[PDB]
Symmetry: D3
Subunit: 276 residues, 6 copies
Amino acid sequence: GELISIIVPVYNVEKYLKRCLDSLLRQTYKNFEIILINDGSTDNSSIICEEYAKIDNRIQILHQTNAGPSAARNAGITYASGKYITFVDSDDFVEEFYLEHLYRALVDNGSDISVCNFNSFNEDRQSFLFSITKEKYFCKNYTIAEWMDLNLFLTFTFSPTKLFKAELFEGIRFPLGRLREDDATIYRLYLKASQITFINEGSYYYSQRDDISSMISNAEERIALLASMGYDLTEQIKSYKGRLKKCCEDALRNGQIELYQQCCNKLDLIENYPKE
Amino acid sequence: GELISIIVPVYNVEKYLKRCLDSLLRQTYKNFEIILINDGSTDNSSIICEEYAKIDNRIQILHQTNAGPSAARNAGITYASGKYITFVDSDDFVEEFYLEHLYRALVDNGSDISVCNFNSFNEDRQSFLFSITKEKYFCKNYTIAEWMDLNLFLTFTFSPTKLFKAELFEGIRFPLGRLREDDATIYRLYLKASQITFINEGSYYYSQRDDISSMISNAEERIALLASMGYDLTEQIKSYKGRLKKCCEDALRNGQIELYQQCCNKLDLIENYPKE
Amino acid sequence: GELISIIVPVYNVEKYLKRCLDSLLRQTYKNFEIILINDGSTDNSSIICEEYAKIDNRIQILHQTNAGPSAARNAGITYASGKYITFVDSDDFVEEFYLEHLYRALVDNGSDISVCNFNSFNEDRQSFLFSITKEKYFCKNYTIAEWMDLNLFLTFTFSPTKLFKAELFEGIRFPLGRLREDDATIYRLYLKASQITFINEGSYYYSQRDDISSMISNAEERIALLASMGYDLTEQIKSYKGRLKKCCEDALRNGQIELYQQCCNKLDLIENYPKE
Amino acid sequence: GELISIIVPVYNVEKYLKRCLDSLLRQTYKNFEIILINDGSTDNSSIICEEYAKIDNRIQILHQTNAGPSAARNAGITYASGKYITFVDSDDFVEEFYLEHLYRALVDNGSDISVCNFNSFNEDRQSFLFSITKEKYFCKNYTIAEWMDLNLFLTFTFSPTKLFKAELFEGIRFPLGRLREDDATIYRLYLKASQITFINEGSYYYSQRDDISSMISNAEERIALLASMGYDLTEQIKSYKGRLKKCCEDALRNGQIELYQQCCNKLDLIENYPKE
Amino acid sequence: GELISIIVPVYNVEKYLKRCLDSLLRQTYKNFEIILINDGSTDNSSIICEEYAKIDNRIQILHQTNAGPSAARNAGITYASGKYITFVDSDDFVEEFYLEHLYRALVDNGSDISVCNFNSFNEDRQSFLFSITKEKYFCKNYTIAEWMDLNLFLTFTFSPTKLFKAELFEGIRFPLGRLREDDATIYRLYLKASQITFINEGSYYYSQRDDISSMISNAEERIALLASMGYDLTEQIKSYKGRLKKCCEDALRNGQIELYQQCCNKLDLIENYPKE
Amino acid sequence: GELISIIVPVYNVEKYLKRCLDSLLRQTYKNFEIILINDGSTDNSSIICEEYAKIDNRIQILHQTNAGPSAARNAGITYASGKYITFVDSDDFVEEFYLEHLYRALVDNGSDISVCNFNSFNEDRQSFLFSITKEKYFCKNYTIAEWMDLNLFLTFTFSPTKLFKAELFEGIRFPLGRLREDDATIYRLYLKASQITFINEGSYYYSQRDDISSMISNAEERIALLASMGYDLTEQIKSYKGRLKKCCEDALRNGQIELYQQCCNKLDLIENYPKE
């Protein structure tokens, strides 16, 4: 099959990196490159990266001065030469059929993007949580409009579990020096697609063991864009009000006083001064 | 009549301050206080403020360490003891009936805000531009919904020309260390009101002689807020698209590269990827 | 009686704030406002402030970006609308007759300031230290000259225990970004007064559990000021020499070398080169 | 005669340095060293220093990273090996008998310090101002007390025109990174002396072509020291009030708002609330 | 022929960029890409880049936040997909046969690098200086040892005029934030080669109209490398001694005192303490 | 005998300082000064320095604002008035005949420098390691060429154990803010000498309980100097290659990515592209 570029930012993940990389090299889909972006790690991560590159030529390492998760992913996008691009966090790990299932779902359906789900691995108790079961499996093709009504963490704020045509990345980059960088970026990729295929299987494992300002501004930017493009706003509005409520309280708890004022005011307007 | 608080930020306006203050002391509406906020001026402005305070007891001076126009206006709001609050920029000036007309328009109509228009004074040629003529005079009461539809500068980005019930300022402050502060704030006051009265009268004179990131952020926040409150988005969407175009080009010219990418991508999505 | 404004700076005092506020709400003198200035606390203090504000309308909260104890007290003074102003630290607490006794001492004597004493509460052993006993109770009126002669901590470095006519604060603010702020400020209030009434009563409880440069600067400024106003300097001189000794040794221990040289030189001049 | 160390800080004085150094090498008193401290000059001053050192072995150069006039003088004091120390600014120049007259005045009278006066040279008009004339010449021995009652620029804030026994410098250094460094330092040298000899001759020529905070704190520190040592305060008090008046006005003009508040308050206390 | 990547850093060169780009698009060698790295220009350079990109698809633009000439070139190297890499400064321009002649000289000779010379253009007088004439034309193949035995500016400190096999860039990047970045880098590419071909034609035009520390450390690094690899040091030593002389004087003129001390000491050792 | 200046930098060594100073005051060679440079210590070191100064007048203290070990030693060199200069680290201690043996070895041989060896003391186990035994004692006079042909730590990167003619320090200072400051400096003193005497006795005790960039640049600077002066480079090259290997690996482990790139490239050139 055609080349898939797997972008893996690496920053101080010495405990988890080998499990991640082992799960990737065992992929049943063979035609991939793994772009490891070592973002200036200060533990053994960089040495682990180098050792893995020595035994599999599909691994390419990029060492860079520490610049954040956004910069690391952008470097990956730049270096990628695949027809498709996908992200894996170096904290996490996948089933051996992960890539193949994503690839088939995309290509067989003529979609521009395929997306799967994730199950959880609790590091503290070394136990899986199989939230997504075989009996609950489904697959569906979605228009962008149908897609934008749908799990909000999975869909909008989590960069892995998703296979993208590389062409979709024209003009699209993660925002620098900013957390919730996934929240600000992934949905812009969806907006460039014509069809998206979702497979409800937890083939990606999320290892289970911030930025209030971005939480709010990401949601505002996204509402403005969707509104300008003619998409329905109902769910984003619900999401936005929920974030404002969290921001209002947490900003105050964190001594982020100007942010607290803004969020409480916005919440006050929405709840107490709606139209009519 | 009831006390009107006039908030006047002062930063290095020695050439224009006396003209401003003279035009305010000549007001036919006499029950006011002028709150001069000297934002750490380094010219003669502070001395001019002190001299005017000595001859009229309606003038109150606040000297503060330089912190920007938003901080200066916020100090004004905090110090105001009037039933109503209005803003005057210290390089502008007004007709002697300015305050009286705004006060009448508000109180006689049972509105929460009254708004007038402005004409221009060209400092370079010392000539007035009477864009707003007596033949074009009108007055009208608006619902908030009617008011929000469309002079975008007069309505949303310009803080003077407007008389606000002081009660409207609960939870509302200008955003710190950041220009287009009026653009981020005035419309939130409108959203608190039940009715607004406009008088199409150029009684305020704007003396004629960029924060590109805020231009975009302000518009996104405002769309998200209006959408969440059920207001129509048609004109804000048009305004947003126009700002994106301006941003896309000007950010690039200024070497603001990440801003440029974000705006160009947003403009690309809107123009080339609207909902199918 | 007339309104007393109680200014209470709050920064990360979650363990002690409730005890403080409970003791204030139980005041037998009921015509007060409590101005809580949350100086950007990062613990639960801000939430505790909000909860108390919901149950007593005499409580006014000001949330501000963290700027230090001087800035917080200055905001308090600016916001106070009382005829009298008093300070309470948020880790301390008071007798239920605290305010009443200070108010009586001031008003019945025609003084401009009344001052009481304090006893101690040892948090580590949960035990009171009643240094000031009923057998030692006295009350006395003082001229400013009598007052300035000498408990140096109680009088000059401690802002609570004192009820001030609000008029005394014209031109007087705590110095920004700088500790021993009380040491720099309280005595300037005394200098504005005509008479001070002291009550030797430990009605305030100080919870028991360095800015070396300011220690010296404050003492030099105060001597210069008193000398310029014709006050006797004998005790201030003794205090200054004691501070120089402390400075000379502690600056050196802290690696504050230029401060050390300055203080040692000053101490050397005073002890070894007095006027022949 | 015994060795005199002449300390000459040099910072960007290319236009004036040769005139200064020429006037020094022509001294009738031959036993001197000139310590040129080049404080990281960025013009030709450093090259001029090196060229002069090549032709007279009494010149010693010390090049140092830019650190200010205080640091440059302190380096000079440290390098000095003379029995006496004197300062010359590299902007200025002297008569050929300058050093000899200072030396004789000190040694013949058994004084610890000798001081002369200065006349002016107006660079803009290339003309001398002989303010100090031959007919006005006098010489006098002073006790420290007599000395401290006396021209305030000449005596207290100007480091040149003065020959000091080197022993007087134990523990005494110019304050770092601070202007009016002379104001803070010279009088401490006087306080270590037993007798001072003044000669009223303008043998030093001051070339005629800031720090408000230090102006005030230097005067406060000096009053506190003098008071502690038992010296009369009358003139220092007059001086202090004059500085407060200048500070109050100039701080405000410069946007130094906290300084303005402090100085105006101090002036208000002194003028309007003196004892009784 | 095979693809040549031309790396063109662009920072604030609006006056010269069109001339540069016009001369490149007129190349007789057709198979190239021009990688324009706009390094956050703040003039019209970015817009000029965009306009040229629209009319010739061999032009690729990378806009980046300003990070300096080294970072710009490194981005070019990373983006380059040619078999050969060459550098052109956007201030300069070339003959229409420039690329073709470099290409032939490399390929026909089996060299890894080809190098030509340059003539100059005086912008102030709009006149060419034809230092390299037709009569002085020669071409020659060199071993690296012969090559490293040489003017000095052309060979080591100037990145254009040179066509490199792209494989030579493994592990070689320009040093960040550093000026004299060419000085630190070009020679390392030479050391990777087996044979270099020089053509003595001035087909590149240098438009004519310092980091002292790097000048010295670059020469020291280069001597240490060459010595470690067994190359002859005679000319590098001569060059190093010349740089020390320049540094010794110019560091002092610039107030770079520690650098002055180091260079003067080094020059002192070399000239006055050679081996016995 | 003539005065030996012992330079002892002191920074936060309260646990070890008394042992150091006791061992120095017990020297059989009596004519020394100990220059204690307290570099702004924040423990009890400064007070320990003062106490020792009070009981032995050979001890001089310089207190300075913290500026690092290089600045501390340079201050020592400046203050030193001895005919000879030696360094002792305040963590360490010496035999009672330490100074005497160094002095005799220098003076009896007509050398400019004498050097001894060191044994170690393991603080964790309170036990001596006598690496240098009586049986292995030797003494020898070396030419500089013989001297520069050598362990490596003792000779070049350790400042104690060495007695220098003070005239050798002309133009030689330790580099500011730099670690491996000994590495950059000691060898330059050797290059000033005509003959060096080594005594193989461990009379200095090193108490036992990295700046990668300097490690590399120091070695490059030293190779360039030695090459320029005609000394043999064989051992320095071996040392340099060893440092590159260490840097290549450890820079990467520390996230020092540009340094890693430079060192790995240098090592790549040396090992894989030596001269043909």
